[PDB]
Amino acid sequence: KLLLANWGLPKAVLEKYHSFGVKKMFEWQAECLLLGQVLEGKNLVYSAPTSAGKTLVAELLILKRVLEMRKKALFILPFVSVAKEKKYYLQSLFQEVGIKVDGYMGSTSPSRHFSSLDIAVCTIERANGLINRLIEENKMDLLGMVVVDELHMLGDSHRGYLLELLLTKICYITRKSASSNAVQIVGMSATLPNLELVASWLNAELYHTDFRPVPLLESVKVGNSIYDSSMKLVREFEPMLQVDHVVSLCYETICDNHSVLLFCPSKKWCEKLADIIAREFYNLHHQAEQKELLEVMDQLRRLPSGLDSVLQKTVPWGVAFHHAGLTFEERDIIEGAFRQGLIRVLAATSTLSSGVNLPARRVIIRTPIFGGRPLDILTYKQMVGRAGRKGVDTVGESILICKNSEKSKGIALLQGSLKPVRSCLVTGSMIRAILEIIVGGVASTSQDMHTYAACTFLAASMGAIEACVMWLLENEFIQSTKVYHPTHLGSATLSSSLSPADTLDIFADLQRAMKGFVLENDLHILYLVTPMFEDWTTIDWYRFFCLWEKLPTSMKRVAELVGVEEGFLARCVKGKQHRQMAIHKRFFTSLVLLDLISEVPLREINQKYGCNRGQIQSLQQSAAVYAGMITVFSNRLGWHNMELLLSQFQKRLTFGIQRELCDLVRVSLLNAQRARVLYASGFHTVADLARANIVEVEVILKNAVPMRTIWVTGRKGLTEREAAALIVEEARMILQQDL
Ligand SMILES: COc1ccccc1-c1ccncc1C(=O)Nc1nnc(OCc2ccc(Cl)cc2)s1
């Protein structure tokens, strides 16, 4: 029975699955897919190692709930990078059968309407908003499927509560129409202890497996000795050519024509511990594919930030580093190079662990102490689950390097297990949930309000709702007639997907901005769409004051109209208040975005502001999301003179462009530099680019360099000719299917 052809499956999807290598399932997937009425709608909650092909069952169930019972489906993923990878994977897997798959990730939204879509690959943040939109207009009959990758995220997380709110709201809808399902829910999780609780909460069937196609050997390293998980010595390591012996371990891994993952606790540590192995691989291997590696170097060299000095020293030896400091393009290039075997040693941080699927033969975790704290058991499991490539390696090795006292934390990580899932639900999450149900009209009376809380994970794990209702009533989010009805502010909060806690100050700030606005720059329209400071960078006070001393004769007008000062503007803090700190740290943040929408090169922004390019890109993505939310908030409040101003800044921040390119960047392959060089040559509209001379745009893309040197997000590397051919084809499709 274990064969993808025996199971009912489209021929096109079957032949696409044979391309990636999936031709015979495992026993665990069959036992999970044949777990009673799961194929009919009984929700499904299952656990498996990430290397065991967890998502195959989810994709099969989607194809089912989409083909047989034609309806929409949601694929909720934890992060934007993995969500985009899954969106492109599902697109390449489902294009032939005609299932329109599009993504709601970060700032990007599908050009086509959600009604035209058939699968929405969403982040946790945007899937909740999508379901809120479906409930408001009441199009909840379109939804028939919801898939939640990384179900364990529903516990303690900054975006996990939105996951719980996503399901307890759906279940109520299914359990209020009952006065094998109407909306199926399929969840993928890790080896959680209380998975059962989660399975019973969602009524889902529970499937737990521990099968790993490639066996895993986790071990600790103390001094020169290697011990297994159960405090048993397994090997006496002796360095081959050593000048921790981290480099010797990497050398031993490399000698057998394999690759290695090296998880370091910081960025500078990754850059240092990739330089070191590069130096030894030169000296130890030169007594002093290439072509593919030179292609990778050239791909990295035609980027807005260009080549990196440490990357330049490391990469032409098989060794490199992959941390959050690099741009998303550089990170994807390095990840692709490692995935193809071109890069053999990858010094990465913990951020990779939870990101893309990047398996390595040996995973060396330098220290059990990550960022001054012991490594998380979930983080450790995520790292060591990458040890072993399926279908290539016979085994996989994880080596955690510990010493002295550190040995204790290492053995604790070796013998530890995942903590149980939580609920995280007065509190902001419960306020959000109460507002979501009341404003959607799904629940009106307080008896219904407690009935809703009887459907949440808190009720399954085993007052607050009254406090939440009181808070929403006292803050004019909700009116009482005691039937609770949404107000205009309460409806606008649920529409623009913002926390009701933040929406109060957002309302005050926008209302103050309407009274006095500065239209002679884009800084006032940016201070409103600037999310916060958070921790996106470590602000240098002197640098800030210097920039401020050199602002146009019109910026400081915007600075003083929003709350910034000069007596406290990188002044007092220069030689050394919770709101003024949040204003200046928002002013600086709004200055950086000012250079992002002014098309300033990332390296120049880094030099003038001191923030690296990864932080700048993260900030611009967050600001674009916030701009979209603020635009919807003003749209639903009847603020036509502010929504009109904000309607373009989401795109101008997503792509970091000027207004002129806002039509060119609609093309998927025109980010902010293949559109500026294509705009200077006379193409200023997606109309002029549909018939743009093919060979002409090839020449233009060949010029202006900061074979497949051009790198495209989701398309990896593209040759100039193929790149601009796809550019003109995308322009043709955009202008042809939008009218
Ligand atoms: C405020 O909405 C944003 C808009 C731009 C960019 C980011 C956000 C955002 C930010 C932070 N958290 C969440 C969101 C979010 O996506 N909320 C959404 N609500 N509705 C959407 O459209 C989906 C949709 C539309 C029509 C139908 Cl019939 C069905 C579904 S998206």
CA dist., res. 94 & res. 60, Å (int): 11
Closest ligand 1 atom to residue 497 Cα is: 1
CA dist., res. 308 & res. 301, Å (int): 8
In this structure, the strands spanning 362-365 and 345-348 are unpaired
CA distances from 80 to 106, 132, 328 (A): 6, 20, 11
Residue nearest to atom 5 of ligand 1 (CA): 628
Whole-number Å distance, alpha carbon 358 to ligand 1 midpoint, is 30
Question: Is-contact 611 537, C-beta < 8 A?
Answer: yes
Ligand 1-lining residues (CB < 6 angstroms): 104, 107, 114, 125-126, 129-130, 133-134, 137, 139, 496-497, 625, 628-629, 632
CA dist., res. 53 & res. 468, Å (int): 42
Helix 500-515 × helix 488-495 angle, to 10°: 110
Whole-number Å distance, alpha carbon 162 to ligand 1 midpoint, is 13
Which residue, among 68, 52, 51, 38, has the nearest Cα to 147 in the 3D structure? 38
Question: Is-contact 598 658, C-beta < 8 A?
Answer: yes
Which residue, among 330, 364, 328, has the nearest Cα to 345 in the 3D structure? 364
Question: Is-contact 647 631, C-beta < 8 A?
Answer: yes
Which residue among 105, 432, 625, 651 has the greatest number of ligand 1 atoms within 8 angstroms of its CB, and so is best to mutate?
625
Residue nearest to atom 22 of ligand 1 (CA): 130
CA distances from 675 to 204, 278, 548 (A): 48, 36, 31
Whole-number Å distance, alpha carbon 437 to ligand 1 midpoint, is 17
Whole-number Å distance, alpha carbon 304 to ligand 1 midpoint, is 30
CA dist., res. 503 & res. 496, Å (int): 9
DSSP helix/strand/coil, 350:
helix
Instruction: State the first-to-last Cα distance of the chain, in angstroms, to the nearest integer.
Output: 48
Q: Which residues pair with 148 in a beta bridge?
A: 76, 187
DSSP helix/strand/coil, 343:
coil
User: Does 49 count as an annotated binding residue?
Assistant: yes
Whole-number Å distance, alpha carbon 75 to ligand 1 midpoint, is 15
Which residue, among 76, 81, 66, has the nearest Cα to 129 in the 3D structure? 76
Residue nearest to atom 16 of ligand 1 (CA): 126
Question: Is-contact 690 684, C-beta < 8 A?
Answer: no
Q: Which residues pair with 374 in a beta bridge?
A: 369
Residue nearest to atom 8 of ligand 1 (CA): 629
Helix 602-609 × helix 580-597 angle, to 10°: 150
Closest ligand 1 atom to residue 624 Cα is: 6
What DSSP letter does each residue of 616-659 carry, written as one string? HHHHHHHHHHHHHHHHHHHHHTT-HHHHHHHTTHHHHHHTT--G
CA distances from 549 to 3, 543, 554, 570 (A): 69, 10, 12, 10
Q: Which residues pair with 75 in a beta bridge?
A: 121, 147
Question: Is-contact 65 185, C-beta < 8 A?
Answer: no
Greatest alpha-carbon span in the chain = 85
Chain breaks after residues in the chain, where C lies over 2.5 Å from next N: 179, 243, 288, 425, 462, 481, 576, 706
Cβ within 8 Å of residue 661, ≥6 positions away: 655, 670, 672, 675, 676, 679
Residue type, 527: Y
CA dist., res. 292 & res. 198, Å (int): 47
CA dist., res. 118 & res. 73, Å (int): 6
Which residue among 136, 140, 158, 497 has the greatest number of ligand 1 atoms within 8 angstroms of its CB, and so is best to mutate?
497
Residue nearest to atom 3 of ligand 1 (CA): 629
User: Does 349 count as an annotated binding residue?
Assistant: no
Closest ligand 1 atom to residue 629 Cα is: 1
Residue type, 330: E
Number of Cβ atoms within 10 Å of the Cβ of 285: 13
Question: Is-contact 728 697, C-beta < 8 A?
Answer: yes
CA dist., res. 496 & res. 494, Å (int): 6
Q: What is the structure's resolution, reported in angstroms to one decimal?
A: 3.2
Q: Please compute, for residue 614, the number of CA atoms within 13 A of its CA located in the half-sphere on the CB side.
A: 13
- CA dihedral angle for residue 129, residue 131, residue 133, residue 135, rounded to 10 degrees: -140
Whole-number Å distance, alpha carbon 529 to ligand 1 midpoint, is 16
CA distances from 117 to 76, 290, 650, 731 (A): 15, 43, 22, 20
User: Does 553 count as an annotated binding residue?
Assistant: no
CA dist., res. 601 & res. 114, Å (int): 35
Which residue among 107, 532, 632, 654 has the greatest number of ligand 1 atoms within 8 angstroms of its CB, and so is best to mutate?
632
DSSP helix/strand/coil, 710:
strand
CA dist., res. 430 & res. 423, Å (int): 10
Whole-number Å distance, alpha carbon 526 to ligand 1 midpoint, is 20
Which residue among 72, 108, 130 has the greatest number of ligand 1 atoms within 8 angstroms of its CB, and so is best to mutate?
130
User: Does 48 count as an annotated binding residue?
Assistant: yes
Residue nearest to atom 4 of ligand 1 (CA): 628
CA dist., res. 500 & res. 632, Å (int): 14
Cβ within 8 Å of residue 73, ≥6 positions away: 62, 65, 66, 118, 119, 120, 143, 144, 145, 146, 147
In this structure, the strands spanning 345-348 and 72-77 are unpaired
Which residue, among 325, 329, 293, has the nearest Cα to 312 in the 3D structure? 293
Whole-number Å distance, alpha carbon 133 to ligand 1 midpoint, is 8
CA dist., res. 578 & res. 588, Å (int): 16
CA dist., res. 359 & res. 364, Å (int): 12
Whole-number Å distance, alpha carbon 527 to ligand 1 midpoint, is 21
CA dist., res. 483 & res. 481, Å (int): 5
Burial 638-668 (b: 16+ CB within 10 A, else e): ebeebbebbebbbbbbbbbbbeebebbbbbb
CA dist., res. 434 & res. 465, Å (int): 7
Residue nearest to atom 7 of ligand 1 (CA): 625
Which residue, among 348, 346, 424, 420, has the nearest Cα to 378 in the 3D structure? 420
In this structure, the strands spanning 216-222 and 396-402 are parallel
| Residue tagged 């209702």 (tokens) | 469
Closest ligand 1 atom to residue 107 Cα is: 6
| H-helix or E-strand spanning residue 249 | helix 246-255
| Residue tagged 């701009």 (tokens) | 627
Task: At 690, list the tokens.
Answer: 């549909």
Q: Please compute, for residue 215, the number of CA atoms within 13 A of its CA located in the half-sphere on the CB side.
A: 3
Question: Is-contact 653 596, C-beta < 8 A?
Answer: yes
How remote is the C-alpha of 324 from its chain's centroid? 13
Whole-number Å distance, alpha carbon 129 to ligand 1 midpoint, is 5
Cβ within 8 Å of residue 463, ≥6 positions away: none
Closest ligand 1 atom to residue 139 Cα is: 28
Whole-number Å distance, alpha carbon 14 to ligand 1 midpoint, is 33
CA dist., res. 131 & res. 273, Å (int): 45
User: Does 340 count as an annotated binding residue?
Assistant: no
Number of Cβ atoms within 10 Å of the Cβ of 393: 18
